[PDB]
Design a protein around this nucleic acid. Structure first.
Lengths: 130, 212, 65, 113, 80, 141, 189
RNA sequence: UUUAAUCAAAGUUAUUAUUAAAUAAUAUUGAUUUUGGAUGAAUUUAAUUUUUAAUUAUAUU
RNA sequence: AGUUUAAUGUUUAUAAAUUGAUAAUUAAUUUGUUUUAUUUUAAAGUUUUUAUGAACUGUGAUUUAUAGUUUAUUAUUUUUAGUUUAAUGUUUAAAUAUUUAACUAGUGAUGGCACAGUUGUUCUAUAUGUACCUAUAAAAAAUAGUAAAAUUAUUUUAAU
RNA sequence: UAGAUGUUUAAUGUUAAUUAAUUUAUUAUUUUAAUAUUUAAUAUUUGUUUAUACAAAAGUAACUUUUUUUGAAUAUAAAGAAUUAUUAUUAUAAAUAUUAUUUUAAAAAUAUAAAAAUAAAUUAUAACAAUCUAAAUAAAUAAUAAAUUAAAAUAAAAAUUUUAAAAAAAAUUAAAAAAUUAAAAUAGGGCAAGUCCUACUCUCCUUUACAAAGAGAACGUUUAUAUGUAAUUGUACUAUAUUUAUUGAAAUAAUAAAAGG
C-alpha cells in the first residue's frame, strides 16, 4: 500500500479516441450513387463521383470519400478531427496569453500560424529601406 | 530511499565536487612534461615539471612541489609503511615556465598556419614570446593483450561482407513481408466491400426485371 | 496535551492526537549519538528506528582507501 | 475478451488463472493489459492474488509480488489431457545459432600490436 | 491523434484568406480566417497566379453584409 | 518564514497590487443633498435646511408663516464629524486642505488634466458635462 | 478600474439592502494567477520503496514509447517502418532476436565447486522460460542431459553503498536444472 | 594527619557549502521507461455567462 | 522568532464663490508643476463552495442442525460461553478493561448487493455515521464592531 | 551636581569613498520553536520454568542456492490495538511431546485473598495465614514568579486578604499520614417574564403545487391567479395632535436569565 500512493499518480498514456460511428458507417458510401452497367452487373467508373466527394476524416483510415448528399451525418467527426487532440487545459497556455493572436483557433485547433523568421523580417524590412 | 542530513551533504559536496556537469577546465592546457611554476598558496613561486595530470579534477602532479608522506597501512605481512610523495595540486594556482621568457604566460590551443605547420596550425601558443608548443598524446598501453583470447589484427581485417549476395537477400526478406500485409489488408477491402457491391449488382438485376 | 515542544526529541509530555508520532524506538538526541544508539551503528548497521540513513563513508576513508 | 481460462478455472481447482503476456507476433490472445480500465484488476493479481473457491490461492501465495512484465510469453492453452496443448512454437526463442571453429575463427576479443 | 487534419472550409480564393467558419458552415468562435496553404505560399507566387482584374475581385468587400450567409451581417466584423 | 520549509517549499496563493477605492467616496450622496458647505476657506460652515418636517392631517391653515425656508448651519460638532471623513484623503500632510463636499471646476479639471491624460481628446475639458453630440441620422443598432 | 469592495460602515452603513455579500472570497487580491498546490500533497509518481516487495507499475507511461520509437527507428527524423514490416519477424528489433540472441546465463560458481553435483543452478534472466533454457544449453554449450528444470523467480539483491544510497542488482531467476550426470569443477589444488 | 560544618562557577568550541527569495517577456500535448495487445473502441471533455484573458480619473444617475 | 497612521511644502505657473433653477458678479482674500496609494497584532461562535466517508457503529441479503441439560409434548421449561447493570481502573495491561446487574430460546441471519451530511440507518434515543456529531476534507472572509490579551525606544522640561 | 516647569532614540560606528586592533548600545517579562532544568535518591521496568495445532486476508523492517509440481506462467513464513504491550487474530481440523521468559533477607495503610459463629450453595470479615521490600541498573509524568524563610499568639484595609505590624523563637535528614494551603459569585424553596412547546380564525418571502389563458390542449411549455399553514416567521383660522389597529393564544409542566428570602 505504501507504494500505491506514489505509483497510482503516474499519468497513463492519453489520446483522443474520437467518436465511432456505428449507425452511419461512412465506409459503405463509396458504393452510393454508382451507376451499374447492365450486362456486367458492376459499378462502371464514374469520373464525376470523386468530385462530389466530401472526404470524411477517420482514425483508422486516412479519409473516406462520401457523396456530398450524405455528408451531414458526419459533421461531428469533422469537428472532432479539427480539434487539437489534446484537452484544451493542457494547451491552454496558447490561448490566454498574447499568443492568442498568433495561433489558429477554428474548431479549437490550437495550431500555430505562419511566423516570419528573424532573418527574413530583417531583409523584408530592409528591401523596403525603412 | 532517503536523503542525508543537511550537514551530511555539505560535507559530501565539498569532497567530490567534480560530480558537477563539466567540472573540467574548458580548454585543457596542462599536460605531462609541461614546465610550470606555482603562483599562490603554499610555497608561492617554485618551479617543477609536471609528471601526471588528473584531468577531471583540474589538478596536477608536479615534481618536488607540495610533497607529503603517504602513509601505507598494511596487514600482518608488512609493517606500517610510510612513503613520501608529492600531491595533486590544483591547476588554478600554477602557470607555465615559458621556455624563453620564464615568466607568466597563458597558453591557448590556436588555429591557422604560420610557417609550414603540418596541419597548418599551431598547438599551444605563448602570448608573450610567441614560441608555440605542441599538445602531445596520452599514452595507450603497449603491453596489453591476451594471446589466448585476442584475435590478431588480420582476422579482424578479412572482409567477408559481399553486399551483392546478402543485401539483395535482405530486401527479399523485407519485401515479402510488405507484399503480404498489404494484400492481407485487402481482406476487409474485399470481405466487407464485396458484400456491398452485391446489394448493387443485386439491384441492377431486380431493376432489369421490373421494367420487363 | 502537548506540554513541551513539537520536535520528536522534546522534553515534556505529548499526545498522539495533536502531535501524532511515528513510533521511533531510539534515535539520536540534539547533542549527538550517545553510546546507546551506536551499539547499533556498529552491530545493526543503522540506527534502530530505520528512518536515519547510514553514512558509513568517513570510516571507509579511514580503513579501506 | 481474452481466453476465459485465464479468468476462471479451466478445471476444478483453477489451473489457468493468472496474468499472461504474449509475443506481439503470435495470434495467441493474452490477458495482460495496462489500460486504466484493466489496472484495478491487474493489480489485484499482483498484490492480492486469486482465491479459488477450492481453497488454494493460485497466482500469488507468498510474499514477493510476481512481475507481470518479465513473464515468458504465452505458448498454449491447457487441455484436461496434458499440462499444455502447445499451440505456437513461434514464441519459443529456441536458440538456433550454430558455430564453427574450423577456419578463420573470431575470438571474442581482438588484439592490437 | 488525427491522420490528415482536414483542410479549411472555403479556400477557393487565391490571394485573400478564407472566411471564418459558420459563415461557410462550421463552428463560430473566430473572426478571422487563416489558410496555412495561403501563408506558406510566398508572395511572388501568390501574385503570380492572379491578375489585377482578379485581385480586385477577391479583395472584394461586402462590409455591412456577409458574402456567404444571405441577409446576414459580416460575422467577421461583428462584436463576436 | 525561516529559510526553507514545507510552508515555503510548496506554493500557496500569491498576492498582487490592491485596487484602490473610488477617489471621492467620502462625499457620500446622503450629504450632497442634505447640506451645502458655504463660506470662505478657514470659515467653511455646513448649512442645512432648517425647520420642522411633519406632514399633518388636512390642517396647516397657515402657508405663509409655514417653514421660512432658511439655511441654518449644522451643529459645530457634526461638521467636524463629517469633515473628518474628508481629510483622510491625505493624512499626515499639514499642507493639503479638506476635500470639498461638492466638486469644483478645478477638481473636475485637474482630475483629467494630468500628463497621463494629455491625449485623451474625448472626455477632456469636461466632455461628460456637455450635452451629447447630435448623433448621426443614419445611426442604427 | 475595478474599484475595491469597501468595508467602512457608518453614516450609510446599510449593507442589509442592495449590498450583495462581498464576503465571497477575494479573487481580486490573489489575482496572481498561478495555481496553488493541493493541500493533500500528491507524492511524486516515482516509486521510493526498494525492498523485496517492489511491485511493477502497470500504468503505461508516455515518454516510454517516444523513446522506444527513436530506438527502433529515428522518430522525429526517419519515417515510420511500414506496418507490414513493423509487425513482421523482419522488423529489426525482432530481427536481431532470431539471429542475435542476447541472454546471460550465469552459473553460480559456488554451486559446482570441488563438490560433485547432479543439479547445477543458473541465474537466468526472468524472461527465459523452462524450455527456452534447455534449448539454450543444448545449442550453445551442447549440454543435452537435462531431466527437469525448476524455477525460483528471485528478486535481485539490494545493498547500500558507502554513502548509504540504496542500490539493487538486476532481478534474475534460479533454475535448478536436473542433470543426468554428476558434474563438478576440478579446482586446481 | 587534623578537615566543626559550611560557602563560589566569569566572558570558547573544528572541517567540509554556494543554496534560497524577488527580479528578467525569446519553451511548452500531462514529469518519473517502452500504448492498445482484439487488431479495436479501453487512451475522448466539446456547449455565446467578470474565464489561469486581471479595467489611466474625483462628474451624472 | 515576534505587531507599519509619509514629522520637509524654494525661481517657468496660472487654483474665490453662489441659486431650491434659469441665471446672476465687486462673490472680497489665500495655498499647491497638480501633493491622492495608509490605516495596529492575536483572537472565539460561525458561514460558504466543492468534495469524501458503512474496514466503525447503524438497518437488508446469501448461512438451512462441530457441544452438555428439565418436561409426555414436534411446544418446551430450559441451556445460555450471545443481550440494557455495578465496583476497581483513574496517562490504567485498555484514548472504556475485569468482575457486579436487569429477559428473551434462532425453519429467518455473521458482511453478499445497497444507502451519505439543510442528511443516511432509524425497533422516532434531536441516539449512531472510524478514538471531541462543532460529522470529516479543501479553499476563505463578515467573525473580541466584546471588563478579551498583547502592542519593541532610561536619564525627560509646562498646567488642570 | 547641574540647561529648563519632566513620555515622538542618540549614529559618516573600521566613510557601505574603510582595510591590523571597531574592542560597535544591546537584549520586547508574556502569544513563538528549539534547548536546559525542577518534579527525580522517584512512578513504571526487573525474566529459574507451560502442556503445542494447520486457511484467508494480514507483512515483506526480508533473507536465501540447494530440490514446489511432472502442469507453463506465477507465488510459497512475519498482525492488529502507536509496541517485542490486557491477546489461542480460529474459516477449518483436532488429542497422553516436561518442547522452554518473570528479579528481590524486614515494618504499615491499602490491594487480592483467607481455620472459627447470630440442609443448601451464600453472607458480612474493615480477623490468622499468602502475594506486593530496600539497595543495584534503568528511567519517566503532569507542576514550576520567586522567596530568605518558616513554628506559634495576637489587632488592623468598601476587603474576599495576599501582605504588612506588634509579640514570639522557629534546627538538619528520611519515612508515613492528609489538618491546612494549588480544581467556577453555587445547592433549596417563593415570584415574574423568556426561549422551548402545543393550537389555529386574522401575519409575512415561501417552493412543490392545482386550476385559468395559449395553441382543432396526446400529453412536455410560458403568463395571469388564492388555495394548505402546508413551514420556516414575527406579533405585550395657528395651532394642539402623531409617530403603534398591521397575526391572535395557552401554569407553554422543562430550560434559561433576573430579582426577593
Amino acid at each position: 500500500s505504501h507504494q500505491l500512493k506514489r505509483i497510482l499518480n503516474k499519468k497513463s498514456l492519453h489520446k483522443y479516441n474520437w467518436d465511432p460511428l456505428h449507425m452511419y458507417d461512412p465506409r459503405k458510401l463509396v458504393h452510393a450513387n454508382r451507376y451499374v452497367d447492365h450486362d456486367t452487373y458492376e459499378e462502371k467508373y464514374d469520373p464525376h463521383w470523386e468530385h462530389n466527394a466530401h472526404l470524411v476524416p477517420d482514425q483508422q483510415f486516412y479519409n473516406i470519400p462520401v457523396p456530398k448528399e450524405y455528408k451531414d451525418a458526419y459533421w461531428w467527426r469533422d469537428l472532432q478531427a479539427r480539434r487539437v487532440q489534446c484537452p484544451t487545459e493542457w494547451v491552454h497556455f496558447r490561448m490566454h496569453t498574447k499568443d492568442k493572436l498568433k495561433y489558429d483557433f477554428q474548431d479549437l485547433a490550437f495550431r500555430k500560424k505562419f511566423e516570419y523568421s528573424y532573418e527574413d523580417v530583417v531583409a523584408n524590412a530592409k528591401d523596403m529601406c525603412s | 530511499a532517503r536523503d542525508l542530513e543537511s550537514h551530511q551533504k555539505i560535507q559530501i559536496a565539498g569532497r567530490y565536487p567534480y560530480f558537477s556537469p563539466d567540472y573540467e577546465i574548458k580548454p585543457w592546457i596542462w599536460y605531462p612534461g609541461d614546465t610550470v611554476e606555482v603562483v599562490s598558496g603554499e610555497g608561492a613561486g617554485q618551479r617543477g615539471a609536471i609528471i601526471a595530470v588528473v584531468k577531471y579534477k583540474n589538478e596536477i602532479l608536479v615534481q618536488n612541489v607540495n610533497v607529503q608522506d603517504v602513509v601505507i597501512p598494511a596487514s600482518e605481512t608488512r609493517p606500517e609503511q610510510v612513503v613520501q610523495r608529492e600531491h595533486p595540486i590544483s591547476v588554478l594556482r600554477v602557470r607555465h615556465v615559458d621556455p624563453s621568457t620564464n615568466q607568466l604566460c597563458h597558453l591557448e590551443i590556436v588555429k591557422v598556419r604560420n610557417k609550414e605547420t603540418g596541419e597548418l596550425e599551431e598547438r599551444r601558443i605563448s602570448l608573450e614570446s610567441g614560441a608555440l608548443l605542441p599538445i602531445p598524446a596520452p599514452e595507450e598501453t603497449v603491453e596489453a593483450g591476451d594471446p589466448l583470447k585476442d584475435t590478431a589484427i588480420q582476422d579482424a581485417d578479412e572482409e567477408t561482407y559481399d553486399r551483392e549476395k546478402e543485401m539483395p537477400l535482405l530486401v527479399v526478406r523485407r519485401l515479402q513481408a510488405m507484399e503480404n500485409y498489404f494484400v492481407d489488408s485487402l481482406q476487409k477491402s474485399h470481405e466487407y466491400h464485396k458484400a456491398l457491391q452485391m446489394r448493387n449488382a443485386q439491384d441492377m438485376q431486380t431493376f432489369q426485371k421490373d421494367v420487363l | 496535551y502537548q506540554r513541551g515542544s513539537w520536535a520528536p526529541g522534546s522534553k515534556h509530555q505529548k499526545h498522539m492526537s495533536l502531535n501524532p508520532t511515528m513510533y521511533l524506538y531510539r534515535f539520536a538526541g540534539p547533542h549527538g549519538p550517545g553510546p546507546y544508539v551506536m551499539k547499533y551503528w556498529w552491530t545493526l548497521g543503522c540506527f534502530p528506528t530505520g528512518i536515519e540513513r547510514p553514512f558509513r563513508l568517513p570510516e571507509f576513508l579511514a580503513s579501506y582507501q | 475478451k481474452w481466453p476465459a481460462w485465464m479468468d476462471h478455472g479451466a478445471d476444478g481447482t483453477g489451473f489457468g488463472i493468472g496474468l499472461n503476456r504474449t509475443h506481439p507476433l503470435s495470434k495467441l490472445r493474452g490477458n495482460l493489459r495496462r489500460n486504466p480500465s484493466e489496472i484495478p484488476r491487474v493489480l489485484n493479481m499482483m498484490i492480492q492474488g486469486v482465491w479459488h473457491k477450492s481453497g488454494n490461492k493460485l497466482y500469488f501465495r507468498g510474499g514477493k509480488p510476481p512481475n507481470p512484465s518479465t513473464h515468458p510469453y504465452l505458448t498454449g492453452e491447457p487441455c484436461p489431457v496434458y499440462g499444455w496443448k502447445v499451440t505456437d512454437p513461434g514464441v519459443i526463442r529456441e536458440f538456433n545459432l550454430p558455430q564453427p571453429e574450423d577456419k578463420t575463427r573470431y575470438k571474442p576479443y581482438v588484439a592490437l600490436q | 491523434v488525427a491522420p490528415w487534419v482536414p483542410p479549411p472550409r472555403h479556400d477557393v480564393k487565391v490571394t485573400m484568406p478564407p472566411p471564418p467558419g459558420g459563415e461557410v458552415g462550421g463552428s463560430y468562435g473566430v473572426s478571422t480566417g487563416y489558410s496555412d496553404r495561403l501563408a506558406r505560399t510566398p508572395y511572388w507566387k501568390r501574385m503570380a497566379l492572379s491578375t489585377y482584374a482578379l485581385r480586385m475581385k477577391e479583395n472584394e468587400t461586402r462590409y455591412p453584409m456577409s458574402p456567404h450567409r444571405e441577409g446576414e451581417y459580416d460575422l467577421r466584423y461583428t462584436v463576436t | 518564514p525561516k529559510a526553507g520549509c514545507e510552508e515555503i517549499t510548496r506554493q500557496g496563493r500569491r498576492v498582487v497590487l490592491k485596487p484602490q477605492e473610488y477617489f471621492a467616496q467620502h462625499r457620500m450622496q446622503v450629504w450632497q443633498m442634505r447640506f451645502k458647505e458655504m463660506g470662505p476657506p478657514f470659515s467653511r460652515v455646513w448649512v442645512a435646511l432648517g425647520g420642522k418636517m411633519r406632514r399633518r392631517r388636512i390642517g396647516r391653515q397657515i402657508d405663509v408663516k409655514d417653514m421660512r425656508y432658511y439655511w441654518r448651519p449644522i451643529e459645530p460638532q457634526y461638521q467636524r464629524l463629517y469633515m473628518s471623513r474628508l481629510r483622510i484623503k491625505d493624512h499626515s500632510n499639514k499642507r493639503v486642505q479638506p476635500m470639498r463636499l461638492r466638486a469644483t471646476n478645478n477638481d473636475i479639471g485637474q482630475a483629467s488634466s494630468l500628463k497621463e491624460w494629455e491625449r485623451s481628446s474625448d472626455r477632456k475639458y469636461g466632455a461628460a458635462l456637455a450635452p451629447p453630440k447630435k448623433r448621426d441620422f443614419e445611426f442604427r443598432v | 478600474r475595478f474599484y475595491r469592495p469597501l468595508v467602512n460602515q457608518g453614516i450609510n452603513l446599510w449593507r442589509s439592502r442592495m449590498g450583495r455579500l462581498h464576503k465571497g472570497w477575494t479573487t481580486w487580491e490573489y489575482n496572481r494567477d498561478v495555481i496553488p498546490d493541493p493541500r493533500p500533497f500528491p507524492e511524486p509518481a516515482v516509486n521510493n520503496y526498494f525492498g523485496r516487495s517492489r511491485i511493477w507499475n502497470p500504468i503505461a507511461g508516455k515518454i516510454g514509447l517516444v523513446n522506444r520509437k527513436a530506438e527502433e527507428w529515428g522518430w522525429p527524423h526517419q519515417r515510420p517502418p511500414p506496418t507490414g514490416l513493423r509487425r513482421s519477424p523482419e522488423y529489426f528489433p525482432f530481427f536481431f532476436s532470431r539471429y542475435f540472441p542476447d541472454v546471460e546465463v550465469r552459473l553460480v560458481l559456488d554451486s559446482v565447486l570441488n563438490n560433485e553435483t547432479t543439479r547445477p543452478i543458473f541465474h537466468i534472466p526472468q524472461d527465459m522460460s523452462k524450455q527456452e533454457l534447455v534449448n539454450y544449453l543444448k545449442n550453445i554449450y551442447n549440454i543435452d542431459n537435462v531431466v527437469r528444470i525448476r524455477v525460483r523467480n528471485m528478486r535481485g539483491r539490494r545493498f547500500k553503498n558507502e554513502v548509504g544510497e540504496i542500490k539493487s542488482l538486476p532481478d534474475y531467476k534460479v533454475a535448478v536444472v536436473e542433470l543426468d550426470s554428476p558434474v563438478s569443477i576440478v579446482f586446481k589444488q
